[PDB]
Amino acid sequence: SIQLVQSGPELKKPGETVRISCKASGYSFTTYGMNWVKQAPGKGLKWMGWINTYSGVPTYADDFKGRFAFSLETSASTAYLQINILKNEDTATYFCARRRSDSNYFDYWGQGSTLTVSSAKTTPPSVYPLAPGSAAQTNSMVTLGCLVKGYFPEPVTVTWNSGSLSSGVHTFPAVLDLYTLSSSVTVPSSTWPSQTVTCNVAHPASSTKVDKKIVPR
Amino acid sequence: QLVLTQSSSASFSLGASAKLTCTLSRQHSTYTIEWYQQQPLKPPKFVMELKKDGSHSTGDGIPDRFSGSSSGAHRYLSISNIQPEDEAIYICGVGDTIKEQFVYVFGGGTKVTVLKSTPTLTVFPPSSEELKENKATLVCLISNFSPSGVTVAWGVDTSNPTFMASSFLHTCQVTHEG
């Protein structure tokens, strides 16, 4: 059946160039023009234009004349978007899409490719165990945390006891010139510190895997 | 100047009649528009095509609850008996051909949510380890609250809600409906 499969996420520096792919399947590739749509994070969809899949001729929307280029290799049913002289504002998710027109609408979409353009260098997190400030006394529960500080780019993953603790786990979204986030887990006070509780932090982009065990303070 | 104007954000109570507005620029008041809906980490999905007379054709896997209508330059999407699964960003679009060139424009989208819990706070002192490094980060975790709006006051950075939210000072005070 019909689908559009796009290449994976990309991280580039300002001034560089990038190419995004859109592989179509399940239909006659040269019959339907390929459209491109930009969506900056939190923002609205910007139609970038479209390319004729038979003649190769691209049609650019007004705000995308200059640094943008649509291309294709029809025998591979694949369309491409190239962006030159990258800048921070190019940070977006990009979609390719097919349109039917006899009724008119975008009937099929790529899953999107996420582009990040930043001057920041890839950086592993410092991980800090967060123990409570006081002993639990007679509270039934206790809440432990991990601080994942100054990493780039997104994302990291945190598990607790190698995935063994799952309920009571809350990983909060990261803030900003690097990323920092925090994970918390809530467990019975009859469980910790009597039993061992360890947070597992993975930041693939730097190939880091860190275990930090929570000890009373 | 072909332009679509949308109402940006709206919440509704479960069961309520929702009604979103997409307003065409006046020179284009007769245009047919397209509705789409977009889930958080996903491409927009076609919902319906709405004509100036209110006639609409819906995409497939689109409930009977969804309906369209029009009046002048306004195009309306109405979601009766709204459901948690109806949560989406709803976006209208419109195509036109001018001087033998096709042009398409999307509205800015309207984030629709479906809807009381007072937040719980967890605060952490800095670690020994961090202190050796001569830095100190205070951590304020905020959880178990609805609805989403919160303000946090204590070198501060505070996340947005996703409810839950986080604040870091490099006392934590959270205001929520009071």
JSON list of C-alpha atoms in Angstrom, two decimals, chain A residues 35 37 39 43-47 50 59 65 95 99 103-107 109-112 126 128-133 143-145 147 149 170-176 180-184 212 217, chain B residues 34 36 38 41-46 49 57 91 95 101-108 122-130 133 135 137 139 141-143 157-162 164-166 168 170:
[
{"chain": "A", "resi": 35, "resn": "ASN", "atom": "CA", "xyz": [5.07, 18.70, -1.85]},
{"chain": "A", "resi": 37, "resn": "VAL", "atom": "CA", "xyz": [6.01, 21.44, 4.28]},
{"chain": "A", "resi": 39, "resn": "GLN", "atom": "CA", "xyz": [7.02, 23.11, 10.69]},
{"chain": "A", "resi": 43, "resn": "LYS", "atom": "CA", "xyz": [4.90, 26.96, 15.06]},
{"chain": "A", "resi": 44, "resn": "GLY", "atom": "CA", "xyz": [2.47, 26.56, 12.15]},
{"chain": "A", "resi": 45, "resn": "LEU", "atom": "CA", "xyz": [2.88, 24.68, 8.85]},
{"chain": "A", "resi": 46, "resn": "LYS", "atom": "CA", "xyz": [4.65, 26.43, 6.02]},
{"chain": "A", "resi": 47, "resn": "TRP", "atom": "CA", "xyz": [4.08, 25.10, 2.49]},
{"chain": "A", "resi": 50, "resn": "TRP", "atom": "CA", "xyz": [6.34, 21.32, -4.87]},
{"chain": "A", "resi": 59, "resn": "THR", "atom": "CA", "xyz": [7.88, 25.33, -7.89]},
{"chain": "A", "resi": 65, "resn": "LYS", "atom": "CA", "xyz": [13.33, 31.01, -2.97]},
{"chain": "A", "resi": 95, "resn": "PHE", "atom": "CA", "xyz": [7.35, 16.78, 5.72]},
{"chain": "A", "resi": 99, "resn": "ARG", "atom": "CA", "xyz": [-1.85, 15.51, -3.00]},
{"chain": "A", "resi": 103, "resn": "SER", "atom": "CA", "xyz": [-12.01, 16.64, -4.13]},
{"chain": "A", "resi": 104, "resn": "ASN", "atom": "CA", "xyz": [-8.58, 18.10, -3.23]},
{"chain": "A", "resi": 105, "resn": "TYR", "atom": "CA", "xyz": [-6.29, 17.50, -0.25]},
{"chain": "A", "resi": 106, "resn": "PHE", "atom": "CA", "xyz": [-3.04, 16.10, 1.03]},
{"chain": "A", "resi": 107, "resn": "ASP", "atom": "CA", "xyz": [-3.78, 12.38, 1.09]},
{"chain": "A", "resi": 109, "resn": "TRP", "atom": "CA", "xyz": [2.51, 12.29, 4.32]},
{"chain": "A", "resi": 110, "resn": "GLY", "atom": "CA", "xyz": [6.08, 11.37, 5.17]},
{"chain": "A", "resi": 111, "resn": "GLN", "atom": "CA", "xyz": [6.60, 10.79, 8.90]},
{"chain": "A", "resi": 112, "resn": "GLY", "atom": "CA", "xyz": [8.66, 13.97, 8.90]},
{"chain": "A", "resi": 126, "resn": "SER", "atom": "CA", "xyz": [26.86, 15.20, 34.36]},
{"chain": "A", "resi": 128, "resn": "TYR", "atom": "CA", "xyz": [23.75, 13.78, 40.07]},
{"chain": "A", "resi": 129, "resn": "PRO", "atom": "CA", "xyz": [21.83, 11.58, 42.52]},
{"chain": "A", "resi": 130, "resn": "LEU", "atom": "CA", "xyz": [19.05, 13.45, 44.35]},
{"chain": "A", "resi": 131, "resn": "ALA", "atom": "CA", "xyz": [18.41, 12.09, 47.84]},
{"chain": "A", "resi": 132, "resn": "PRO", "atom": "CA", "xyz": [15.70, 13.60, 50.01]},
{"chain": "A", "resi": 133, "resn": "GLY", "atom": "CA", "xyz": [16.77, 16.32, 52.43]},
{"chain": "A", "resi": 143, "resn": "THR", "atom": "CA", "xyz": [10.75, 10.25, 46.41]},
{"chain": "A", "resi": 144, "resn": "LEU", "atom": "CA", "xyz": [14.21, 9.93, 44.87]},
{"chain": "A", "resi": 145, "resn": "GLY", "atom": "CA", "xyz": [15.67, 11.74, 41.91]},
{"chain": "A", "resi": 147, "resn": "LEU", "atom": "CA", "xyz": [19.73, 15.35, 37.89]},
{"chain": "A", "resi": 149, "resn": "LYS", "atom": "CA", "xyz": [22.80, 18.33, 33.60]},
{"chain": "A", "resi": 170, "resn": "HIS", "atom": "CA", "xyz": [8.35, 10.64, 36.33]},
{"chain": "A", "resi": 171, "resn": "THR", "atom": "CA", "xyz": [10.85, 12.03, 33.85]},
{"chain": "A", "resi": 172, "resn": "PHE", "atom": "CA", "xyz": [10.37, 15.76, 33.48]},
{"chain": "A", "resi": 173, "resn": "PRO", "atom": "CA", "xyz": [10.89, 17.59, 30.16]},
{"chain": "A", "resi": 174, "resn": "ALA", "atom": "CA", "xyz": [14.31, 19.28, 29.73]},
{"chain": "A", "resi": 175, "resn": "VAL", "atom": "CA", "xyz": [15.05, 23.01, 29.95]},
{"chain": "A", "resi": 176, "resn": "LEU", "atom": "CA", "xyz": [17.80, 25.20, 28.43]},
{"chain": "A", "resi": 180, "resn": "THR", "atom": "CA", "xyz": [19.15, 19.80, 31.80]},
{"chain": "A", "resi": 181, "resn": "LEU", "atom": "CA", "xyz": [16.36, 17.53, 33.01]},
{"chain": "A", "resi": 182, "resn": "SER", "atom": "CA", "xyz": [15.34, 15.51, 36.05]},
{"chain": "A", "resi": 183, "resn": "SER", "atom": "CA", "xyz": [13.78, 12.10, 36.77]},
{"chain": "A", "resi": 184, "resn": "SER", "atom": "CA", "xyz": [11.99, 11.12, 39.96]},
{"chain": "A", "resi": 212, "resn": "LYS", "atom": "CA", "xyz": [24.02, 6.65, 39.81]},
{"chain": "A", "resi": 217, "resn": "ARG", "atom": "CA", "xyz": [22.68, 12.16, 52.52]},
{"chain": "B", "resi": 34, "resn": "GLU", "atom": "CA", "xyz": [-9.19, 21.65, 3.90]},
{"chain": "B", "resi": 36, "resn": "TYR", "atom": "CA", "xyz": [-6.39, 18.57, 8.98]},
{"chain": "B", "resi": 38, "resn": "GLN", "atom": "CA", "xyz": [-2.14, 16.72, 13.83]},
{"chain": "B", "resi": 41, "resn": "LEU", "atom": "CA", "xyz": [4.73, 13.51, 16.94]},
{"chain": "B", "resi": 42, "resn": "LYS", "atom": "CA", "xyz": [3.12, 12.82, 13.59]},
{"chain": "B", "resi": 43, "resn": "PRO", "atom": "CA", "xyz": [2.16, 14.29, 10.19]},
{"chain": "B", "resi": 44, "resn": "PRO", "atom": "CA", "xyz": [-1.17, 16.12, 9.85]},
{"chain": "B", "resi": 45, "resn": "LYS", "atom": "CA", "xyz": [-4.09, 13.87, 8.84]},
{"chain": "B", "resi": 46, "resn": "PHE", "atom": "CA", "xyz": [-6.87, 14.90, 6.45]},
{"chain": "B", "resi": 49, "resn": "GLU", "atom": "CA", "xyz": [-12.87, 19.46, 2.72]},
{"chain": "B", "resi": 57, "resn": "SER", "atom": "CA", "xyz": [-16.65, 15.49, 2.45]},
{"chain": "B", "resi": 91, "resn": "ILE", "atom": "CA", "xyz": [-5.28, 23.17, 10.94]},
{"chain": "B", "resi": 95, "resn": "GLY", "atom": "CA", "xyz": [-4.91, 26.08, -2.31]},
{"chain": "B", "resi": 101, "resn": "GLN", "atom": "CA", "xyz": [1.28, 28.70, -10.32]},
{"chain": "B", "resi": 102, "resn": "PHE", "atom": "CA", "xyz": [-0.29, 26.66, -7.54]},
{"chain": "B", "resi": 103, "resn": "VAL", "atom": "CA", "xyz": [-0.05, 28.20, -4.02]},
{"chain": "B", "resi": 104, "resn": "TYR", "atom": "CA", "xyz": [-1.02, 26.67, -0.71]},
{"chain": "B", "resi": 105, "resn": "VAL", "atom": "CA", "xyz": [-1.43, 28.26, 2.73]},
{"chain": "B", "resi": 106, "resn": "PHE", "atom": "CA", "xyz": [-2.00, 26.80, 6.18]},
{"chain": "B", "resi": 107, "resn": "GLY", "atom": "CA", "xyz": [-3.61, 28.59, 9.10]},
{"chain": "B", "resi": 108, "resn": "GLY", "atom": "CA", "xyz": [-1.55, 28.70, 12.30]},
{"chain": "B", "resi": 122, "resn": "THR", "atom": "CA", "xyz": [9.10, 17.79, 45.41]},
{"chain": "B", "resi": 123, "resn": "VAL", "atom": "CA", "xyz": [12.26, 19.76, 46.15]},
{"chain": "B", "resi": 124, "resn": "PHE", "atom": "CA", "xyz": [15.84, 18.58, 46.15]},
{"chain": "B", "resi": 125, "resn": "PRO", "atom": "CA", "xyz": [18.97, 20.06, 47.67]},
{"chain": "B", "resi": 126, "resn": "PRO", "atom": "CA", "xyz": [22.16, 19.94, 45.58]},
{"chain": "B", "resi": 127, "resn": "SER", "atom": "CA", "xyz": [24.20, 16.72, 45.76]},
{"chain": "B", "resi": 128, "resn": "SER", "atom": "CA", "xyz": [27.57, 16.29, 47.50]},
{"chain": "B", "resi": 129, "resn": "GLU", "atom": "CA", "xyz": [29.10, 15.56, 44.10]},
{"chain": "B", "resi": 130, "resn": "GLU", "atom": "CA", "xyz": [27.77, 18.75, 42.54]},
{"chain": "B", "resi": 133, "resn": "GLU", "atom": "CA", "xyz": [32.28, 20.93, 41.64]},
{"chain": "B", "resi": 135, "resn": "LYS", "atom": "CA", "xyz": [28.01, 24.46, 41.58]},
{"chain": "B", "resi": 137, "resn": "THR", "atom": "CA", "xyz": [21.28, 23.31, 41.39]},
{"chain": "B", "resi": 139, "resn": "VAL", "atom": "CA", "xyz": [15.37, 21.22, 41.82]},
{"chain": "B", "resi": 141, "resn": "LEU", "atom": "CA", "xyz": [9.44, 19.08, 40.58]},
{"chain": "B", "resi": 142, "resn": "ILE", "atom": "CA", "xyz": [5.79, 19.87, 40.07]},
{"chain": "B", "resi": 143, "resn": "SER", "atom": "CA", "xyz": [3.28, 17.15, 39.48]},
{"chain": "B", "resi": 157, "resn": "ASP", "atom": "CA", "xyz": [14.76, 28.08, 34.33]},
{"chain": "B", "resi": 158, "resn": "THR", "atom": "CA", "xyz": [11.34, 26.50, 34.37]},
{"chain": "B", "resi": 159, "resn": "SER", "atom": "CA", "xyz": [9.94, 24.04, 31.88]},
{"chain": "B", "resi": 160, "resn": "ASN", "atom": "CA", "xyz": [6.56, 24.16, 30.23]},
{"chain": "B", "resi": 161, "resn": "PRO", "atom": "CA", "xyz": [3.88, 21.67, 31.32]},
{"chain": "B", "resi": 162, "resn": "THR", "atom": "CA", "xyz": [3.41, 18.35, 29.51]},
{"chain": "B", "resi": 164, "resn": "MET", "atom": "CA", "xyz": [3.95, 17.94, 35.18]},
{"chain": "B", "resi": 165, "resn": "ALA", "atom": "CA", "xyz": [6.69, 20.62, 35.06]},
{"chain": "B", "resi": 166, "resn": "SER", "atom": "CA", "xyz": [10.16, 21.37, 36.44]},
{"chain": "B", "resi": 168, "resn": "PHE", "atom": "CA", "xyz": [15.79, 24.76, 38.45]},
{"chain": "B", "resi": 170, "resn": "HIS", "atom": "CA", "xyz": [21.31, 27.39, 39.84]}
]
